[PDB]
Every structure is written in structure tokens, then in C-alpha cells.
Amino acid sequence: YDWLKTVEPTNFLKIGLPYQAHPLHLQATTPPSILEKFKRADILLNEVKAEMDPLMLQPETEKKLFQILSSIDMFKGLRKKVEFTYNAQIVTNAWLKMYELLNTMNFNNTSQAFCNCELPGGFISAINHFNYTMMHYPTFNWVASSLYPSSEDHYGLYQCNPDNWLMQSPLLKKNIDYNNGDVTIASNVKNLALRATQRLTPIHLYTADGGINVDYNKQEELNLKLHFGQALTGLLSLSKGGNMILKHYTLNHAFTLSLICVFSHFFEELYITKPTSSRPTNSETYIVGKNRLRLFTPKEEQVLLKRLEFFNDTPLVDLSLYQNLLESVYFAVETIHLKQQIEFLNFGMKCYRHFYNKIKLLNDYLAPKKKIFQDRWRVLNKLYVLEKKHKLKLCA
Amino acid sequence: YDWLKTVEPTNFLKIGLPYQAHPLHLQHQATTPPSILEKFKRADILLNEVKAEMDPLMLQPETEKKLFQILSSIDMFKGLRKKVEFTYNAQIVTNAWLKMYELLNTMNFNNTSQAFCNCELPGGFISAINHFNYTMMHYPTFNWVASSLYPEDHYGLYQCNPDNWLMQSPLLKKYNNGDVTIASNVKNLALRATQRLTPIHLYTADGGIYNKQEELNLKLHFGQALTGLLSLSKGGNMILKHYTLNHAFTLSLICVFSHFFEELYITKPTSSRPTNSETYIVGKNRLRLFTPKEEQVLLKRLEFFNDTPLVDLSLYQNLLESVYFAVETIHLKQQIEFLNFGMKCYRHFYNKIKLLNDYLAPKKKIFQDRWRVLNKLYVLEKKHKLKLCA
Numbered sequence: 093y094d095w096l097k098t099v100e101p102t103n104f105l106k107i108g109l110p111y112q113a114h115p116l117h118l119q120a121t122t123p124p125s126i127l128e129k130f131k132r133a134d135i136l137l138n139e140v141k142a143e144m145d146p147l148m149l150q151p152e153t154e155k156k157l158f159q160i161l162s163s164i165d166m167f168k169g170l171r172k173k174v175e176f177t178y179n180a181q182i183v184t185n186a187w188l189k190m191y192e193l194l195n196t197m198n199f200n201n202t203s204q205a206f207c208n209c210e211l212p213g214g215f216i217s218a219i220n221h222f223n224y225t226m227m228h229y230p231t232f233n234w235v236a237s238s239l240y241p242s243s244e245d246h247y248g249l250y251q252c253n254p255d256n257w258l259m260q261s262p263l264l265k266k267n268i269d270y271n272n273g274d275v276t277i278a279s280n281v282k283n284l285a286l287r288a289t290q291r292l293t294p295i296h297l298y299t300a301d302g303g304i305n306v307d308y309n310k311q312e313e314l315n316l317k318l319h320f321g322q323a324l325t326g327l328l329s330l331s332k333g334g335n336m337i338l339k340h341y342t343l344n345h346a347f348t349l350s351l352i353c354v355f356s357h358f359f360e361e362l363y364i365t366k367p368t369s370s371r372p373t374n375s376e377t378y379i380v381g382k383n384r385l386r387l388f389t390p391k392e393e394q395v396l397l398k399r400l401e402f403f404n405d406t407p408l409v410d411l412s413l414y415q416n417l418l419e420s421v422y423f424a425v426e427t428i429h430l431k432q433q434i435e436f437l438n439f440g441m442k443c444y445r446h447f448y449n450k451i452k453l454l455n456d457y458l459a460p461k462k463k464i465f466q467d468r469w470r471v472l473n474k475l476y477v478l479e480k481k482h483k484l485k486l487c488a
Numbered sequence: 489y490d491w492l493k494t495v496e497p498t499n500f501l502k503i504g505l506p507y508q509a510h511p512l513h514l515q516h517q518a519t520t521p522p523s524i525l526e527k528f529k530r531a532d533i534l535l536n537e538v539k540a541e542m543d544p545l546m547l548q549p550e551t552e553k554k555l556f557q558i559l560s561s562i563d564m565f566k567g568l569r570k571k572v573e574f575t576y577n578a579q580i581v582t583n584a585w586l587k588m589y590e591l592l593n594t595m596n597f598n599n600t601s602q603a604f605c606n607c608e609l610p611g612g613f614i615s616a617i618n619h620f621n622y623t624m625m626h627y628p629t630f631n632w633v634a635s636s637l638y639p640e641d642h643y644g645l646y647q648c649n650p651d652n653w654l655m656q657s658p659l660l661k662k663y664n665n666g667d668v669t670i671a672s673n674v675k676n677l678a679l680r681a682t683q684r685l686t687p688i689h690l691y692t693a694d695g696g697i698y699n700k701q702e703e704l705n706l707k708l709h710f711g712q713a714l715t716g717l718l719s720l721s722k723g724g725n726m727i728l729k730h731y732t733l734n735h736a737f738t739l740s741l742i743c744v745f746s747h748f749f750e751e752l753y754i755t756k757p758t759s760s761r762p763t764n765s766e767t768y769i770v771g772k773n774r775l776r777l778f779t780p781k782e783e784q785v786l787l788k789r790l791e792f793f794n795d796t797p798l799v800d801l802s803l804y805q806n807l808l809e810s811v812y813f814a815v816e817t818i819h820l821k822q823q824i825e826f827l828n829f830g831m832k833c834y835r836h837f838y839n840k841i842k843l844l845n846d847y848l849a850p851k852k853k854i855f856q857d858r859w860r861v862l863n864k865l866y867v868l869e870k871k872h873k874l875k876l877c878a
């Protein structure tokens with residue numbers, strides 16, 4: 093009915109965080125009152141997220157819920173087009189997300205990528221595709237890692253490029269320095285960053301796209317350690333003047349807020365971002381630091397690695413020293429999560445309610461709206477055919 | 489905090505349903521549901537979405553406690569029970585008392601004097617009716633029979649009136665334990681009611697065992713319904729407690745009701761908590777009794793119970809529309825707004841409970857003074873008190 097066509101196209105949400113003049117002290121203390129706003133956001137957003145619980149109780153309705161949520165992905169058809177028409181590889185939704193990030197973030201240099209938690213490899217491939225067709229980089233050097241458990245590389249990007257991947261297979265289990273890619277493990281983060289700086293100087297682009305897979309309303313808290321080792325891997329490897337793209341989620345926990353406060357001292361610009369192709373129904377955010385200003389001191393490295401090693405929830409910094417910054421993160425929360433995500437979660441519920449058994453009919457009603465959003469994406473993020481000689485080597 | 493200072497009393501919600509002239513045909517065969525059942529499915533999905541919004545607070549008992557404090561803070565009638573109890577010598581002033589009393593004061597029953605109150609313990613419904621009959625109706629004597637799944641009898645109303653109660657203690661397993669999900673007990677209860685009390689002008693049923701609350705209760709509410717319908721005399725009235733009214737069985741049962749009463753309502757008394765889905769189906773002026781077959785078909789329906797509609801729902805479009813409007817008014821609009829309101833109170837006051845109570849106390853008194861003005865109360869004389877053993 094009406095609601096289905098009035099859908100507004102979404103914007104690349106990009107919220108700058110103000111630069112923090114004072115030096116960094118990793119020390120928590122009496123939290124600033126703004127933390128209360130964030131907890132209200134988290135309660136509210138979990139409330140709206142909790143609305144899909146009844147649907148989760150039976151695998152029948154769960155399946156139909158995710159069909160509906162896939163039906164309101166406004167960009168899925170764009171992936172097939174971009175592959176077929178422009179020779180893009182590994183055109184997952186992450187490819188779209190990375191390519192959109194690279195166009196609108198205007199990075200100074202993306203010619204040397206370390207992509208962490210990358211397993212399929214959309215980010216690498218988008219970076220590759222961007223660097224050749226848009227940045228006209230003579231060559232592209234990259235390294236990647238992903239969690240290789242001793243228990244996936246859907247496109248063969250890992251196995252067809254063993255030199256470019258920094259974790260080790262389960263055949264190297266029992267090695268004293270076995271690095272399975274798990275960035276929740278402090279020694280793996282040291283080793284990964286050491287290994288990257290070795291195959292790659294300088295590293296201009298760090299990306300980290302990891303997420304625990306589980307319950308939906310503890311998602312940020314369940315990922316704090318992963319996302320903290322993601323960040324640490326990047327801050328140990330990224331060169332000065334380098335750039336960082338980290339996948340996050342809701343940003344309401346003090347720890348997350350404190351880690352952003354940490355990020356605030358290392359980059360000249362720092363954005364919380366939500367590409368349009370980042371599914372507005374989820375809480376996923378990408379934290380983007382442009383122009384790394386300086387590297388860790390040996391003390392900062394020690395402390396943060398010790399935190400990752402013996403992890404806990406507590407703020408990394410005194411959060412009341414960053415009132416300005418939390419106000420802008422809160423704006424980002426309000427824009428990305430309390431406004432956009434809640435509306436698109438509500439819209440998704442309304443789609444489930446009215447179409448849970450009429451999936452075909454829902455995709456028929458949205459198809460023109462989908463094309464409008466993919467058209468506008470194609471206008472904003474110019475695409476160019478990638479030359480065979482600059483494809484990635486794929487084994488699948 | 490304007491959204492606290494413009495809070496206004498709720499209104500008695502009352503949605504008339506159309507009586508069906510067409511002859512009742514109890515269904516033998518499953519049938520293709522009418523498309524309006526989909527809109528009831530959507531109301532159920534939505535109402536469960538908003539209910540689900542409290543799940544995250546449910547997981548950790550620390551925030552669970554705060555949530556129930558918050559829902560207590562927003563219960564606008566919280567102190568009314570005790571005010572009613574002292575001021576007017578009212579008995580068993582549970583919330584069921586207020587609800588039945590409000591029901592009696594709004595629905596303008598032709599007669600409330602020969603009561604069968606089923607699934608009734610501790611006895612607020614009987615008490616409200618006793619209170620209303622003696623202070624408001626002035627019947628010479630009020631005769632009533634009651635039943636309830638054998639105890640809990642928190643006021644000794646059952647212990648002290650063995651003549652009036654139609655279920656039996658476990659020492660009589662020989663037997664009717666007052667479980668209205670058992671067809672034989674339902675028929676038996678009705679017989680017992682019609683023998684101990686002739687005639688029966690008022691039947692009430694207050695039984696209830698969250699996504700499936702309605703569905704978990706279908707059998708119970710069917711038995712409730714059958715017990716009344718098998719014993720409610722002609723011209724008599726019925727008050728049935730329900731919940732969400734979205735399952736096709738429920739709707740089909742309302743359909744059955746529509747053949748037997750001159751008027752038929754879905755109601756949400758203000759003293760029924762606006763945050764829960766509780767409804768009261770009210771039939772006024774029973775026009776006819778079951779035929780023998782209708783009794784056999786319906787009781788057999790309860791004996792080997794399933795979901796399937798009692799009637800062809802597609803022959804009740806009009807009624808079904810009026811029910812939807814009831815669901816729209818009570819559940820999708822009122823109840824969802826009040827749950828939302830509770831969640832908004834939780835977020836802003838989960839740590840400021842005393843403050844929220846301060847904000848709402850003046851409103852709580854205006855709401856309660858309003859209920860007292862709308863449902864006038866008079867002191868109940870001692871010689872008309874029910875006899876209580878506790």
C-alpha cells in the first residue's frame with residue numbers, strides 16, 4: 093500500500109568527530125552524564141530490536157523474517173550488475189560498502205591495504221577495483237588476515253594468494269607462534285601487525301570488518317574484544333598518514349566510546365559512517381580515521397595490548413575529557429541508530445507483517461524503489477570496467 | 489516531561505458487536521478463512537512486537553525488577569483498591585472487584601441478581617456483584633453460585649459458603665474439580681448451577697492461565713464460554729474475560745456468542761490494566777438457549793479440542809469488522825500506547841522511580857477520583873457482607 097512507495101532514499105551517513113587537542117592518558121572515574129543518553133539509546137534500540145523476538149521463536153517465521161529483511165536490501169541487485177558490467181570480483185555487499193566508503197571518504201592514499209577479518213574478501217577487491225579504475229595506481233600491494241579456526245574463503249582469494257594472507261592454517265597449530273587470525277588474542281595482534289609491516293611499508297589503508305556471530309541486543313558488548321583487537325591490529329600496523337576503516341555496531345558502551353576517544357588522538361579526521369549499502373536495518377557502523385597523525389608510544393602499545401590480553405569492559409580513558417566528542421558520537425548514534433535504523437527496523441516489521449507470506453509480491457512492489465536507490469548509488473560512486481590484467485587471483 | 493503532565497484518564501472502552509440473525513451453523517469441517525483474518529494476524533504480530541520490546545529488560549533480574557517497579561509506577565489505579573475497601577466496607581477488593589464493579593456500572597444490565605461466577609476465586613467478581621446488588625440494585629436477597637479450579641481461596645469465600653460453590657475438594661475424587669477445560673465438568677458445572685439457582689441472570693467467568701497467551705487460553709476460555717452458555721437463562725447476561733481476540737478460534741467463539749444475545753460488546757474497563765491485553769466480552773439479554781445439538785456439538789468440540797473455528801468465519805464479515813475495531817481500539821491503539829508509555833517511563837526513570845511516582849501521584853488521584861465518580865460507590869451494610877473464613 094502507500095507506505096511502500098513513500099520510502100525515501102538514504103544518505104551515506106558521515107558524522108565527523110572533533111579533533112582532540114589534549115594528550116592521551118590511558119588510565120575508571122565518575123562517568124560523564126552524557127553516558128546516560130547513550131544508555132537510553134541502547135535501551136531504546138534494544139527495545140526496537142527486541143520486536144523481532146516473537147518471530148525468532150520458530151524456524152519457520154525466523155526464515156521468513158530474514159527473507160523480508162533481504163527483500164528490503166535496496167542494493168542486492170546492484171552487486172550482480174557491478175560484477176557483470178564492470179568486471180568486479182567478490183561483489184558481496186561488503187564490496188559495495190567498501191567501494192562507497194572509498195568514493196565518499198576521499199582518502200589521501202589507498203595503495204597499500206591491510207584488510208583484517210576479511211575472509212571472503214569484498215573489501216580487498218573493492219579496494220583493488222577502486223585503486224586501478226579510479227586511483228590509477230600503477231600497482232596495488234595488500235595483505236589480509238581473517239580468523240582461520242582449527243575446526244570462509246568463498247572465492248579462493250586466500251588460497252590463491254598465500255603470500256598476501258597473514259594468518260596460518262590449522263596445519264601450523266601447535267607451532268609456538270601459531271597465529272590463526274583471532275584478533276581477540278594479544279599475541280596474534282602483535283604478530284599480525286608485525287607481519288603486515290614486514291610485507292608492506294608503508295601501510296596506507298587499514299580495514300577491519302569483523303563481527304562475532306550470535307542473541308541480537310548484546311551485539312556491541314559481545315564484539316568489544318574483537319573490535320578492540322581489530323583496532324589494535326590497525327593501530328600497530330597503519331603508517332603515519334595512513335587511513336583506517338573499522339566495522340563497529342551500536343557505539344553505546346563506555347568501552348566503545350573510550351576507544352573512539354583513543355582513535356581521536358591518532359587521526360587528523362575521524363568519522364562514524366553508515367554507507368547506504370550498509371544495511372540500514374542493522375547497527376553496523378564504519379569508523380574512519382583519515383591521515384594518521386602519529387604512532388603509538390611504547391607505553392601506549394604496552395597498555396592497550398595488556399588490555400586486549402586481560403580484557404575487561406572499563407573505559408580506556410576518562411570520558412569526561414571528551415564531552416565534545418561524545419556529543420558528536422551521540423549525534424551519530426541518533427542519526428544512524430535511533431533515527432535511521434529504528435525507522436528501517438519499523439519499516440522492516442511492517443513489511444514482515446503485510447508480506448511475510450507474500451515475499452514475491454514485496455519484491456515486486458520494491459523493485460522500482462530498489463532501482464532508484466541503485467541508480468543514485470551509481471551516480472554517487474562512479475564505476476569503471478576493471479582490466480583483466482588487474483583482477484585478483486581467485487581460486488573459486 | 490510534558491508527556492507526563494498531559495496524561496489523561498482512560499475511558500471505558502466499549503465496542504458493540506452485531507447480533508447475527510442468520511441461523512447458527514456449528515462447523516463440522518475446517519474451512520477457508522476470510523481475508524479479514526489476515527488483518528487479525530497482523531494485529532497479533534504487531535501487538536507481540538510491542539510486547540516484545542520489554543524482553544531485553546527481562547533477561548537480567550536487576551533490570552527486571554526496575555521494569556516491574558516502572559509498570560507499578562504507571563498503574564494509575566494503584567491505591568484505589570484499598571480506598572474502595574475501607575471507604576465502603578467492600579470485600580475481596582482485588583482488581584477483579586473494580587473491574588466487575590466498573591462493568592456493572594457501565595453495561596446497564598437488565599438484572600444482576602442470580603449470579604453464576606465461574607473461574608472465580610478469590611471472589612472479587614461475586615463480591616463486586618454482591619456489593620453492587622445490595623448498595624445499587626436493592627434486590628431483596630442476592631443468590632449466587634460460584635466455581636473455580638479447586639484452590640486459590642485467599643479470603644475464605646469458598647470455605648465459608650459450601651452451599652454456593654459447585655466444584656469439589658480433592659477428598660471427593662470418586663467428581664468436578666471445577667476445571668472448565670473438561671467437557672464433562674463443564675456440563676456438570678452448568679447442571680449444578682441450574683439446579684442450585686433458578687433462574688440465572690448473570691454469568692461471569694474470570695479465568696486465565698505472552699505471544700501465545702490467547703492461544704494457551706483458548707480451551708479455558710472455551711470452557712468458560714460453554715459453562716455460561718449452558719446455564720445462562722434466557723434474558724440473562726454474560727461477562728467473559730478474554731485477551732487479544734486475534735486467534736480464529738476466539739473470533740469464531742465470539743461469532744457463536746452473537747447468536748444468543750440481543751447486544752454484544754468487547755470491553756476494556758479502565759480498571760482493567762491498559763498495558764495488558766485483557767478484554768471482557770459482555771452479552772446482554774440472552775435471546776435463546778442452545779438446541780440439544782448445539783450443546784452436543786459444542787461440548788464435543790471442547791472434549792476433543794482443536795484450533796479449528798467453531799463456525800464459518802466468512803459468514804460474519806460484519807461482526808469480524810466490529811471485533812477488529814475492538815482489537816484496534818483496545819490493543820493496537822490503547823494497549824500499545826500504554827506499553828510504549830511504560831517503556832518511555834522505563835528509559836527516563838529506571839533509576840528515578842521515586843521521581844516518576846511524584847510526577848504521577850497527582851494524576852493518580854485524579855484518575856482514581858474519576859473512577860469513583862463514574863462508578864458511584866455506597867457503603868455496604870454489614871448484614872449484606874459475604875461470609876468470609878479468612
Ligand SMILES: Nc1ncnc2c1ncn2[C@@H]1O[C@H](CSCC[C@H](N)C(=O)O)[C@@H](O)[C@H]1O
Pocket residue numbers: 184186187208209210211212213214215216238239244273274275276301302303304318
Ligand atoms: N576473533 C576474530 N578475529 C579475526 N577474524 C575474525 C574473528 N571472528 C570472526 N572473524 C572473521 O571476521 C570476518 C567478518 S566478515 C568479513 C567481510 C568481508 N569484508 C567481505 O569480504 O565480505 C569473518 O570471515 C570471520 O571469520
